[PDB]
């Protein structure tokens, strides 16, 4: 199973955007799908989830209330909808499926990346 | 004991080590927090063998060894019991009854560098499967066919690492991963690593 994400682009600071991870196969070994974002200067950042089976979601605290997982499994893909975006929002975005349940979190099947860019004035 | 276990060196070691040539770090007589760990967003991967990472701090061990090492980022799923290629079966192996966590995170940002960082290998070719933590650092010739080599490098005969190319702008799936595996050892001896 191949991700690809989708929906990058430049925005100015207050905008929004939305990102898309869209899944080729369906594997039922994944329990759950993880946004990610990578820029300079610190480590990358898990900033939201949501379980696949019941669509529970997790945010970083740096983007809840401004971020939005969710998921259609009609065609195998997860969203980001972000609203009220800032520029320290400028990242690599990149998605990821793995396992979740009672031994941990595993996210193992990996986008490609894309970049959010996010400008003042 | 009061003294913390010594994961910042561990997990914030300025340079990791080749998966061919991975590092072991023994920790013992020490308080160790694994819940921050887990709790953070810091990690990708935090699966555990053989015991839950939600009970990690109430339990103690005689030793704990902390495995380290860089790899791409499609292999992380081959760190884990029963899993198959060149990675678990050339380069890192865990047993089938492995007793312990995984834990992996991207480190595109330290280990990727313009023009290409070359200098994290792995074992592209072996005879045979590594057995659970065995390492292999040998560099010989090796015979893909039947021709003998002679040490001499050429059809059939091959080098037997292989770099990996880390560019930062490399696809998530090239970029390069951290994987620290911990293992909880209980020997017939007073346990000495403990939570908080
Ligand atoms: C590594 O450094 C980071 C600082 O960004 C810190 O949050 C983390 O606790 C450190 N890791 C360990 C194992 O101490």
């Given at each position: 199973?191949?991700?690809?994400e989708?929906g990058g682009?430049?925005?100015?600071?207050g905008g929004?955007?939305?990102?898309?991870?869209?899944?080729?196969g369906?594997?039922?070994?994944?329990?759950?799908v993880?946004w990610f974002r990578q820029?300079?200067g610190?480590?990358?950042?898990?900033?939201a989830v949501?379980?696949?089976?019941?669509?529970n979601?997790?945010?970083?605290?740096?983007?809840?209330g401004?971020?939005?997982?969710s998921?259609?499994?009609?065609?195998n893909?997860?969203?980001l909808?972000?609203n009220?975006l800032?520029?320290?929002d400028?990242?690599?975005?990149?998605?990821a499926?793995?396992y979740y349940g009672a031994?941990?979190?595993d996210?193992n099947?990996?986008?490609?990346?894309?970049?959010?860019?996010v400008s003042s004035? | 004991?009061?003294?913390?276990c010594?994961?910042?060196?561990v997990?914030?070691?300025?340079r990791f080590?080749?998966?061919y040539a991975?590092?072991?770090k023994?920790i013992?007589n020490?308080?160790?927090?694994?819940?921050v760990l887990?709790?953070?967003?810091?990690?990708?991967?935090?699966?555990?063998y053989?015991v839950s990472p939600?009970?990690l701090?109430?339990?103690?061990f005689?030793n704990?060894?902390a495995?380290s090492?860089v790899?791409?980022g499609?292999?992380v799923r081959?760190?884990?019991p029963?899993?198959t290629?060149?990675?678990?079966?050339?380069?890192?192996k865990?047993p089938?009854?492995?007793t312990?966590?995984?834990?992996?995170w991207?480190?595109n940002?330290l280990?990727?560098?313009?023009?290409?960082?070359?200098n994290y290998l792995?074992?592209?070719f072996?005879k045979s499967?590594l057995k659970?933590f065995?390492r292999?650092?040998?560099?010989?010739?090796?015979?893909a066919?039947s021709?003998?080599?002679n040490?001499?490098?050429?059809?059939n005969?091959?080098?037997?690492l292989?770099?990996?190319?880390?560019?930062?702008?490399?696809?998530?799936g090239?970029?390069?991963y951290r994987?620290?595996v911990?293992?909880?050892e209980?020997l017939?001896?007073?346990?000495?690593?403990?939570?908080?």
């Amino acid at each position: 199973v191949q991700l690809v994400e989708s929906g990058g682009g430049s925005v100015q600071a207050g905008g929004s955007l939305r990102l898309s991870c869209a899944a080729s196969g369906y594997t039922i070994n994944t329990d759950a799908v993880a946004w990610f974002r990578q820029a300079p200067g610190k480590g990358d950042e898990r900033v939201a989830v949501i379980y696949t089976g019941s669509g529970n979601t997790n945010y970083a605290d740096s983007v809840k209330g401004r971020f939005t997982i969710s998921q259609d499994n009609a065609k195998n893909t997860v969203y980001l909808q972000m609203n009220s975006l800032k520029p320290e929002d400028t990242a690599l975005y990149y998605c990821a499926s793995g396992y979740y349940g009672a031994s941990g979190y595993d996210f193992n099947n990996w986008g490609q990346g894309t970049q959010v860019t996010v400008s003042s004035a | 004991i009061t003294n913390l276990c010594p994961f910042g060196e561990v997990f914030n070691a300025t340079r990791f080590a080749s998966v061919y040539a991975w590092n072991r770090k023994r920790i013992s007589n020490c308080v160790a927090d694994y819940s921050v760990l887990y709790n953070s967003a810091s990690f990708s991967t935090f699966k555990c063998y053989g015991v839950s990472p939600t009970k990690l701090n109430d339990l103690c061990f005689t030793n704990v060894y902390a495995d380290s090492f860089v790899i791409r980022g499609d292999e992380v799923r081959q760190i884990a019991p029963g899993q198959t290629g060149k990675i678990a079966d050339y380069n890192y192996k865990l047993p089938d009854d492995f007793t312990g966590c995984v834990i992996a995170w991207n480190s595109n940002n330290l280990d990727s560098k313009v023009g290409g960082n070359y200098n994290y290998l792995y074992r592209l070719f072996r005879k045979s499967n590594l057995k659970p933590f065995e390492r292999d650092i040998s560099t010989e010739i090796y015979q893909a066919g039947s021709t003998p080599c002679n040490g001499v490098e050429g059809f059939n005969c091959y080098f037997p690492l292989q770099s990996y190319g880390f560019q930062p702008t490399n696809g998530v799936g090239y970029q390069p991963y951290r994987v620290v595996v911990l293992s909880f050892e209980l020997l017939h001896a007073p346990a000495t690593v403990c939570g908080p």
